[model samples]
Target chain A: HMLNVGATAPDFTLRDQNQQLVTLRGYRGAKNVLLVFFPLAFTGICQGELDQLRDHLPEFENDDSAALAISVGPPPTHKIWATQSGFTFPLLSDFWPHGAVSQAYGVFNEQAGIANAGTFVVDRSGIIRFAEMKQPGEVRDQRLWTDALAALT
Target chain B: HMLNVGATAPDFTLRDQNQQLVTLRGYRGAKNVLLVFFPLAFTGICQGELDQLRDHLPEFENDDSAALAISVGPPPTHKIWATQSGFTFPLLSDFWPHGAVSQAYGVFNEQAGIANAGTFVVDRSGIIRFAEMKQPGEVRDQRLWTDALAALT
Candidate 1:
């Protein structure tokens, strides 16, 4: 069966865009989180993500919450891409073991040439307040994320 | 809040890598559908999916069922990447309206860039059986998917 609601979210640590260690548990008392899973670094729609979220980060990353974009790209690649794209948030690299994180979240398309779209918002308490993932090539919207975060506060 | 299991699976239609119409409801009766979400078209961790899956596709797609990959890249990009990357599976383009499908899945990241990985599995009856989106920089494993599909069978 699929993971039921209220289940404890699985935890893991990975390098971020800045080449820093980012542990999921590290966010316990610090802030809520929005986990973004995308396909690649240089595409148009993916670029749009930076234009919107990187542009409006203050709206989400206040004293109580943070947002993250996780892909299967390497840290160095992510670092370079983030700088090129002017992304301010964390772009974590799950490259070494390969798709392990995406697999954990059920987004890996081992058969396809690209990754899928999936989003999860975890409250400050570490509870997953919201989660949704779509087929590869599918774009996402964040309206519910704002609404969900507001409810948590 | 997390979505309710057994709730109505959302409906949608998007252009596949072939620029053909692909819809969730259209595939309901013939076979179980696995919707694979990824971050983008031509990156490393995301590339592992294609490299590995190209090696083992029989498990995900066969006579009884099949899978599809979705991304937010435009159709032309997907068309070229599909050839360059040798992705035989149908790749859906959620561009144009721009990441709308990723938004639907809630994995669209604005600040850090792109619609991240969001994977969903819909059974033959059109119900989403297993769904997940990952944090950035994290790759995915398809073993859970193998088991999940086996369970469906």
Candidate 2:
């Protein structure tokens, strides 16, 4: 239930933790967009995955990539989480209308009421280069995401 | 429908952001449980309400009360929110079973699939002293809650 690789990534405007509007298409022609979807914020595997992303941020930054961690958590919750975790990247809230963005990406679970851990690499041209979704309890590997972006160069 | 005052506060065992299990009945005979429910974390009003609780935490503590803010959001989100917001109180997750506890409390909205903002002040005797539920877009006034708690004393 997700957009596949080589597809045109859907553009969306979501409120980040700061309540600032962030547009997916805004990154087009300026920077690649690394859209990472994690099910929930404070769970163990998700925390470890985001920590890895935080640790390797320097590497991901060299390519002018906008890495957004999107979740259905509300903006206030995301704001606090981002602040407490010291996350430099935007943690977008797909909250109002509740996971609409996650649903559009085809990763939303109506029954479970959350998105699966899905990662998508959209190059500067707006073409989805790589897409992968992990089941619950699975952690994401940043190397695969960065490798996809590296290939776009 | 929401829980009524003078009724027994339902017992529950849920995990906090730290993955530690917190039981409602555990506080029985020791301290009052101020069960504060919000629609979601990381929203404007919810954060504001929790901040009010944090600021007035000392007052709540003097009465031997354990204030718990519960939501359907997972534990990780609560952990980060608690840390960033400097909340010393516990934030519990009614996540697994996806709002079952909220349902038992008669505060769960089946149509929206979320827990409405419900507040219940259960005294040490396990009898609810105060109960109130707010509709969406309505912000809670902490003064009313503290007033109820004050009446208990």
Candidate 3:
């Protein structure tokens, strides 16, 4: 809701699963980064969704892409959830300020206290080239993403 | 699966609705940037997702954050969809070279022609603090994002 087609991606730093600082610039010109956004950390829906990404990590690695799962829990909760779920990918803790990024993207639902079903595919150029969102309770289909990456490659 | 919670956030550039170059630095010192990544544009489930954002734009617009949406479509198509769908937010185009961003974010499905459900939340320091993803047909909850943002703030 914040940006439109062809806008620049904003930058910020937040704690990772290990409570380490990660800068968005590090990926500049290095690789294309998939900005995967979802609802919660341990919810059933989130579990099943992230599991697919976990199962297909190779597709992204071989494709020159970097993927990460982000959410609003502090390090403590996120760590517990990631460990329990066996999620190798970083379960980022957007928890300190909680949904700071979600608010920035206008995907934040203040009243409801969750993020919209927003997703973004950022190219190496630091620009937001692709994005989408799903309605309440509606499952997603990433087939279009496949076609797009194929064309870009 | 690619990034651990405690790693650096990757960077990239593409274009905005106005074709103006928006970068990570754009949000420097202002607030955190929410990178809302979704699958497609103009689809049934997608519409509901964005519409939710549209309805709650104020939440994301407040003090600590800004929001943006991305997808694997052409700029023109994004423009049309924005106008027709009443989406005032930027619907980024990741169409050229197709889904390059999607590939970068590791959201594109190799066998399918779409992007997987991926979302990310970057803090003011530009670190991807929160993230998530989903399979086809599963919509996300925005309430969780609200809590995350609040915590970060």
Candidate 4:
């Protein structure tokens, strides 16, 4: 039960890998946001998706948009992972309240105690234009995300 | 209002710095636990205390006792901080379900959204032998903790 397209994306203030705060609404009226939620950091599928996001960063994070990854891992873990993986974008921690933001986005896996793979594209006005939720170990097709971003322009 | 001396220390299973599970009762039969809850990682006072703990690790982590630090910081953050500080004992993450354990110990700072400085020495019987709670910025004397642990034997 992911958030639907055309819904007002929930605003959140989360700590990134550097322990810096990143607020979702901070990009409103300025840049579109690709909010990507994954399970844990050091795992396989999440790393693959993040690698793709890092490679296509320019496409998702250009003049009009920014890509932010969210996970239940703490900022310190995210910091090490991002550094090791060479991911320049913000890796937000939905930790602390332990998946509060993930729950807001309707992607928290209660049984697994982590977030299932979920993605959302929020425009400058903070309205979600694309939404997808996947079960554990499911791979996401980036073409759908690019097509969604293309629609925003 | 921290847990009183002679109260049963709450049982918990938390992820340590290396993402390994450390259960409170796991030490019940063999070792006394020096449970230290601090505000955040990488701060001056917390670092000072952890440094002292690292230096005096032998006193707290011998055959009869163990020292475990905890904070709302995620495991990765704890892992990096512990490694950089050369702390070998477990630095447990109270990040997820943030501060649940701290709350159980009655040291969670609601307004600050972090844990207050709290220390407890739990004997092999799972009873708290020593409990101390301090507000933000207060420095705890290690001698008091040593005295507490000494009393456990």
Cα lDDT, model 1, residue B118? 66
TM-score-sorted candidate list, best first: 4, 2, 1, 3
A1-153: candidate 4 lDDT, tens digit per residue? 789998999999999989899999899998889999998786778889999999888899888889999998767668777888999999998866778899999998886568889999999999999999865556798888989989887
Residue-wise C-alpha lDDT for candidate 3, range B1-153, written one tens digit per residue? 434344455666657655655676567577766667766665667778778878887776578877778775445445656776787777675544456677776666555445666766677777777777755667766666666666778
Q: Candidate 2 local accuracy as lDDT?
A: 0.82
Residue B151's lDDT within candidate 3 is: 70
Prediction 1 global C-alpha lDDT: 0.71
Comparing 1 and 3 by TM-score, which wins? Answer: 1
Please tell me how candidate 3 rates in CAPRI terms: incorrect
Please give the CA lDDT of all the candidate structures.
0.71, 0.82, 0.65, 0.87
Which candidate's DockQ is highest? 2
Candidate 1, residue B62: CA error in Å?
Answer: 1.5
- Can you rank all candidates by DockQ, best first? 2, 4, 1, 3
Q: DockQ scores for all the models shown?
A: 0.02, 0.35, 0.02, 0.21
For each candidate, what TM-score against the reference?
A: 0.49, 0.66, 0.47, 0.83
Every model's TM-score on chain B: 0.88, 0.92, 0.87, 0.96
